[PDB]
Structures are given as structure tokens and as C-alpha cells.
Design a protein around this ligand. Sequence first.
Ligand SMILES: O=C(/C=C/c1cccc(S(=O)(=O)Nc2ccccc2)c1)NO
Ligand SMILES: [K+]
Ligand SMILES: [K+]
Ligand SMILES: [Zn+2]
Length: 353
Amino acid sequence: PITGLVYDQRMMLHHNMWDSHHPELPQRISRIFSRHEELRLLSRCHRIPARLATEEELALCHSSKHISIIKSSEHMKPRDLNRLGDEYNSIFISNESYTCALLAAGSCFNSAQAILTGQVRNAVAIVRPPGHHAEKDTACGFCFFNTAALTARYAQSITRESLRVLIVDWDVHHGNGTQHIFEEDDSVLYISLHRYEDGAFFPNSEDANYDKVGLGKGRGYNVNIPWNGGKMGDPEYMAAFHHLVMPIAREFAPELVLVSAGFDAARGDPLGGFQVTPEGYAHLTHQLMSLAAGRVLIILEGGYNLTSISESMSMCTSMLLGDSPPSLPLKTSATVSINNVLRAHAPFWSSLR
Ligand SMILES: O=C(/C=C/c1cccc(S(=O)(=O)Nc2ccccc2)c1)NO
Ligand SMILES: [K+]
Ligand SMILES: [K+]
Ligand SMILES: [Zn+2]
């Protein structure tokens, strides 16, 4: 049983030239990687090489127009870069942004391929910029291309089109891009837990509410678990996994699990405002490992306290490597959310009835 790991310092080149203290920092990935070295986890993993995604691979989820515009940013002068970034919701662009986004995607493709061919049992991808806010035709929320979504389609492209992929998004923000990309699809089950606040939390859309359950043949295959009015932490995420995530996932019976693993729900995060502990993330990881014969790929999304994300993601890797899970009342607000979701998805999943 081997765990893969992919990391490439080249992905640090993506930077904000107007605000060098923007929280989506280059050192996000180098700090996580360093903590793996310190904990002697890195030597326990198989190093999976990073690669660039091809434009053909990008087209699995994105428009030719969107790909061309971001591709052209590589040669833009600062004026062009500034103005272009500004056309999007919460995006900064440097001349290295395109290449880094390509590396993030290709890294996850290589990891998915290594899992599916059986070279490794599971894997972690320490990548940036993040992806789950990226839409078919636009960049958003620090994201250019939707790495997790592209990875699911890539997985299908090297196995069979109907390969059942589960995406669990525990980043504190709703993955609007991933929801929309798979909204009419029953081969990819999207489950997101996110701070919602009646739509007041980024990305500020009611698309993230629990009553959005998918469209057409994808009805039932989109599960939003929205948190309102409360500093959620380990008890809340454990309860959601017990009543919602794991029952639905077991009925779906995925053949591959992708985790959009942002760590901005972590205690100490400057943007999330939640308090999930590294032990919390470990227990979430360990539960997901009981799915898909252990075929789990953990993909870095957000997370902005450098110490918090380093500790949290390293803990996940420790779980994937087979280490024993560390040891850990429910906020009533969380119970209301979980009940709203159970009511919304009972029509589709018998395990919830
Ligand atoms: O982590 C993210 C994205 C975060 C994000 C995107 C847009 C806006 C915000 S904000 O409301 O917390 N404000 C902010 C903070 C720092 C830089 C830019 C915006 C946060 N997605 O997974
Ligand atoms: K999420
Ligand atoms: K779906
Ligand atoms: Zn986030």
C-alpha cells in the first residue's frame, strides 16, 4: 500500500504584484511540503512528477475562449494583467499564472492516473492556484481552471466515461465551479460543506443552498451542506459526515474519491472563521478511505493560515499512509442545516430514509 505525493516549487511563481500580502501566497505549498519533510512523511511517499495539462485536457471542462484569454496572460504587460484580473471576481494575474494553473491540473492528472493504474493506493496533491471556483467560461476566487473537475473528467477519459467519481469539497467556501460543471451529471457526485450565511459568504450565491440538488439526470447528485450562524468545527463536520456524506457516498459507491481539500475551515484561518482541527481533518480523511477501495486523491484548494494548513494537510497524508487516527455538543444551527439537507435528499437516497 503506497501513498503518492506531488509538489513542484514552480507553482510558487504565481504571485500578486500589487498586493504581495494577498493571502493566496506562494509559500502556501512550500510550507505544507516543508512540514511533510519535518514530520518525515515525505520519504514515506512515492514522489509523483508534476506536468503541464494540455490545452486539449483543459477543454474537458473549459471553453476555448476562456483557455485562450488566460493563456495570453503569459505575455501581458502589467497594465494588461491588472485590467484583466479586474474583469473577474477576486482574481490576480502575473505572467506565471497560466503555467502554474497548468501544473496544478497536470499534477492531479498524474496522481489520478497513478491511483487508477494501481501504482499507488491514494495520493496528495500540494498545488496552487486553487480551482473549485473556476467555471467553464471564467476565472473566479483565486482560481483559473477547475483542477478537481478536470481531474474527474481525466479519470473518466483513461477508464470509462461512466466511471463514478465522488468529489468531496470540504474547503470552507462553496465550489461553485464544480457544482455547475457537473450539475446535470450523475457520474460525478458533488458533495460540498461550506459556510453559507444565507448567501452572505463568498462566493455569495444561493446556488450554494441545500435545495440545489442537481438538474436533469443529475437530480440528486449535487449535495450542498450549508452552515449558518455558528463557528463550526470538528463536532459539526463529524455529524455531517455521519448523517449525510458517508451514507450518500456508500450508496453512490464511487470508484474514485477526489477531495477538494481547502483548509480554510481550519482553526486559525484568517478568512474562514471556523475551527476544524488537524485531528478533525484526519478523521474526515480516514472515513473517506473506506470508500472506493481506498482510491482517494486529496487536492489542495484554499487555506490561508500557513501553520494551520501545513499541520492539517500533513495529518491527512499521515492518514493516507495508514497511521492510526488521533483522538478528538453539536451546535443546534448545524443540526438545522443537516436536517434541511436530509429533507432535500431523502427523495433520492434511500440510506437517508
Ligand atoms: O478560499 C477561497 C477563496 C477565497 C475568497 C475569495 C474572494 C473573496 C474572499 S474574502 O470575502 O474573505 N475577502 C478577501 C480577502 C483577501 C483577499 C481578497 C479578498 C475570499 N476559495 O476556496
Ligand atoms: K466546500
Ligand atoms: K453532479
Ligand atoms: Zn476556500
